[PDB]
Amino acid sequence: GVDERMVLERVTRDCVQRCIVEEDLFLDEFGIQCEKADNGEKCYKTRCTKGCAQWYRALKELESCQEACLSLQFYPYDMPCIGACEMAQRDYWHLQRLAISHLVERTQPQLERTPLTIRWAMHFPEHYPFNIQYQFVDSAWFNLADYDCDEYYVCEILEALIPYTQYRFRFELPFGENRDEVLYSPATPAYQTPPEGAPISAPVIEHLMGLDDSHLAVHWHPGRFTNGPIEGYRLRLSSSEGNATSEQLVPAGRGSYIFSQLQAGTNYTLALSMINKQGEGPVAKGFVQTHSARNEKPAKDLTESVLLVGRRAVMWQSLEPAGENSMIYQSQEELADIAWSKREQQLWLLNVHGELRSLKFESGQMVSPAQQLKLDLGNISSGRWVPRRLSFDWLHHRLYFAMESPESFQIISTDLLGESAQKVGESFDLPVEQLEVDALNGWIFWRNEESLWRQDLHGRMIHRLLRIRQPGWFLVQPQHFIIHLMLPQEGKFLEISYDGGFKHPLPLPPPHWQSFALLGRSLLLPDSGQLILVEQQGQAASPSASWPLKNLPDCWAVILLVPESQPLTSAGGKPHSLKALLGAQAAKISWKEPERNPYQSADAARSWSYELEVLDVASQSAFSIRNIRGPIFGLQRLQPDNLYQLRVRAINVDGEPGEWTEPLAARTWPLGPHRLRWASRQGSVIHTNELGEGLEVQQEQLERLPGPMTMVNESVGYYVTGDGLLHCINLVHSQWGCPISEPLQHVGSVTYDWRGGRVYWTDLARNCVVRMDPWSGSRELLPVFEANFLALDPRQGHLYYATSSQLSRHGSTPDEAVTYYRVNGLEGSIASFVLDTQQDQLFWLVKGSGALRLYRAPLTAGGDSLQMIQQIKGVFQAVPDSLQLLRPLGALLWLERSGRRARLVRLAAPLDVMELPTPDQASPASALQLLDPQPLPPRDEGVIPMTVLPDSVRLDDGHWDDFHVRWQPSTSGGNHSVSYRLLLEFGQRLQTLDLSTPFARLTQLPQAQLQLKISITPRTAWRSGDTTRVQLTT
């Protein structure tokens, strides 16, 4: 069209103007040095204008730019023609990327449905390698492989997909090899795949735990791939030493089940699998033991006591065979509720008139008289909240109430002086008949006329546990997470967990009972004349023990005076996710808290302290540190380059230790100041240490999103800004030191060779590698194609390069071309690579589809092995050209794509991937680099080839068909191999040779009387020499 021809004329005009302006910028390999108006084939201008005449013939004919620019005079590669072809081709693809991007990103694909069919109604211009991608809804985008498509982009999906999943699709459109050229299509509606077959994912067990000696709880949420709607579950509990297995089919709505009637101290195996309409899925297994059998002490051996509470009396009775009965307090009015303390020994009373009286006691005797403690409600009350029920928080020392306003019923918390009222929960209409606080698990349970409830201590999670008509006395086990509730009208006795899902009736012995207590498996039951200890299956006519009562006709509450009624200790402690970051003399160790049960709220007791064990591995000596208040610790005064073994455990408020963590093995750095250099995305540079502390904000200010900076010498550095710009800063004195005035577009990475004294970068526009002298600014085009990242070995001069597909080595001759890795582009691309010189190794990162893989290879020409070191399966990936080698640690270091963390993999221990946090004044980071402690060595004079003398160029005597031109053999200081690039200028035609000999075996000369111009360019693998231009007549 007419829009296409303007793009072709603009790209061709910009290409010809680019060959005009850059005609003196590059030194050619043969030392050409044309004038500004010569118009001969040797020059930069004619070959570069040959590059801009064959860029559109190379796209339509679909030939490479190296295949299109194939000259017999310049063999094997013509650098200005190939370079002008690739900048003109990526200028064309950049203009076609901006020409279509609104119509690409505004029109949206539609799914129609037999195989799955995507319809994408785009009308592309006639002026003109698409990829279809998929993403799992509730990740990263993965490349789809099997698709058959029409030319109108109605695309049929032939890849077999996972059933009963949601899939969102898009069209990735790559304009040309450049990654930026890719334009993404908009998002699709999520598609339910039709379900078939068995499930392929196991259920995920969140909390599997033992409640007591005869109960065992499991909580789970379903796994990711279900392949149908859930019809139910299959739970199979099997003993390790036993022949009785219990199978239970639990339906789809339940995510918790509690096994009952088990055995004590038996370490159980639970099989958990999904059930759908088509089959049964895989089995997830977990290992737990039940608790030990609690001691059924006989009726002769009982040293505990009970509190027997009437309407008008509080009575103390010891549980001895000789029963001691004493009257603690007698009131002239009726009581409503009490509270009690085990360690403070305080016993608050609340009457029917709503006056709160406090009292203290020991051994059934009153040691402090009953003072009246009034409630200072303050701004919380709206007036006349007279109290009805009462309970006590034994951890936060709070009194929890339930009042009455004549209008509504409200639970508050107040202090032991009544000074701090906090309204908890919302108002409700039914009266509380019993109020209990679970202080250890952070719950409060109350019971009304029709039901039983559950709040936490701040009122956040309100749950109704049970609906039953007229419930009686309920008692709370905090250690076993079971509420035992008596039903007096129905005559049974019922056993409820804290979520309310597990209920179980128990045999109540027949008399009505209006209170109970639970001593072991036995049941303390009051009457009007006696208190009996019955073991839950026996009759009331034959108890295990009996205690007579005289002055208590009515007894609505029995409170057992044990410390297990009000515990301090959660009795389960296991710290997890132990991590450690290490320096030379110090370590930064972070773990997490022990995890919360489903029967524990956010107001639970989380008062654990920690003990960390540090084991020296080489000497087997352990020092143990204690009383760590928090989930982090910083170790100090360690030994450098030593392996340490680290375990941690939790110590509860009682001081009872928990179970040790599975050990982490980690090694300190070697001794020395090891300075890590950071660069923020704003452009600021700080210098930290091994641990990320000791920050020094440097004076230099870089450009936005910089890469790693390559030293040439101690003033001048070169870095690649992340839009593609290559910069140059003198850190010391800024008005001199840098040969380039402007930044350079379309540069991938940059390296420096210290021996040749040459800066190497990848020109992504020219698809080649540019070698540049930093003292002068003369550039040299090198025939290394499609390279993104470079490295050079200084011992022999091999250039190691990374394509997005391959990783290879460029030598002086093409016999030395060794390719180390190849990957398909749908599988992934190489993210960065590191050449190791001292141990003769290579490392590279491969950015996969949802994965990050790390590899290793030697530097031999015949490769011995190739080891995949470590794989990270996640959406978080690396910054490209950010892999660094830590040669003191023996480790690899890369920066993650978010820029707020970095990953370290040690070569001795690859499984432990250390996380190092980015410091706060450079907190979005784009570069991380370990500084070399030694300075850079200067330029070797033993790699510079000497100039061939102009009087030494002579012709040997021979015929006209076979001439021989010879010269003095150029050498260097170190005796390296010196090769020669040669130019023959006779008549109009030209002839170029590459030689490894100081003579030239010359043929195909036409005749005699020929004036013959000779150019000698000596070179080594690091650096080319000056050009010797003589004039010789045959």
Ligand SMILES: *[C@@H]1O[C@H](CO)[C@@H](O[C@@H]2O[C@H](CO)[C@@H](O)[C@H](O)[C@H]2NC(C)=O)[C@H](O)[C@H]1NC(C)=O
């Ligand atoms: C670091 O290297 C730079 C070149 O990259 C050196 O600067 C050159 O030094 C001479 C001597 O004064 C100047 O006349 C040149 O103009 C500089 N070259 C360029 C290209 O600008 C510099 O000497 C080095 N610095 C140190 C401290 O060694």
Ligand SMILES: *[C@@H]1O[C@H](CO)[C@@H](O)[C@H](O)[C@H]1NC(C)=O
């Ligand atoms: C429970 O039994 C399994 C073997 O079936 C064993 O691996 C596990 O350690 C046992 N748990 C204990 C002893 O706590």
Ligand SMILES: *[C@@H]1O[C@H](CO)[C@@H](O)[C@H](O)[C@H]1NC(C)=O
């Ligand atoms: C190079 O060879 C010469 C001639 O034998 C010798 O004197 C010199 O030491 C050699 N230099 C090196 C660096 O090997």
